[PDB]
User: Fold Exotoxin 3, putative from Staphylococcus aureus subsp. aureus COL.
Amino acid sequence: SESELKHYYNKPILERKNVTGFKYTDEGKHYLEVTVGQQHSRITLLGSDKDKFKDGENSNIDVFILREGDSRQATNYSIGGVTKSNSVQYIDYINTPILEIKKDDVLKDFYYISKEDISLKELDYRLRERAIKQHGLYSNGLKQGQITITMNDGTTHTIDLSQKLEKERMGESIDGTKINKILVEMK
Assistant:
């Protein structure tokens, strides 16, 4: 649905880097607790992201939190969006791949990478944020389309815009230094 999709991607984001999270298991479910400042949060680990991190304390990790439900409880319940912070300190962006936004009618620009390890959850969200804010995505019936992220080795990561990023993928991450270009087509 247009409004239910525009609603989801208009939700605020809690993004913090260089934090510490505690991983554990509860009933076959794997979680990662993260408490930054006063906001307490529990991240759900699925498919991929669950094995990437070890049980117990995990230091030097970055977090991209988005509350799934609409319930107004204090704690944040998010899925995926956990990556490893950069191995070194960069004072500038690491990579600035080309970003095309075709409402097919093309607009040139770049996507600014500040992370070695970036989760699909972040890209998916940040790209659609831009599409909605400035190109009327999920407004006036404009709901179809596809995101194509091309790497230096030629592999591509495709994300259908007619639906929310499938959960099992929110935990995946890609080498932010190898991203060649990003294409956002709406139709």
User: Anything to note?
Assistant: The domain at 1-10+86-187 is CATH 3.10.20.120 (Ubiquitin-like (UB roll)).
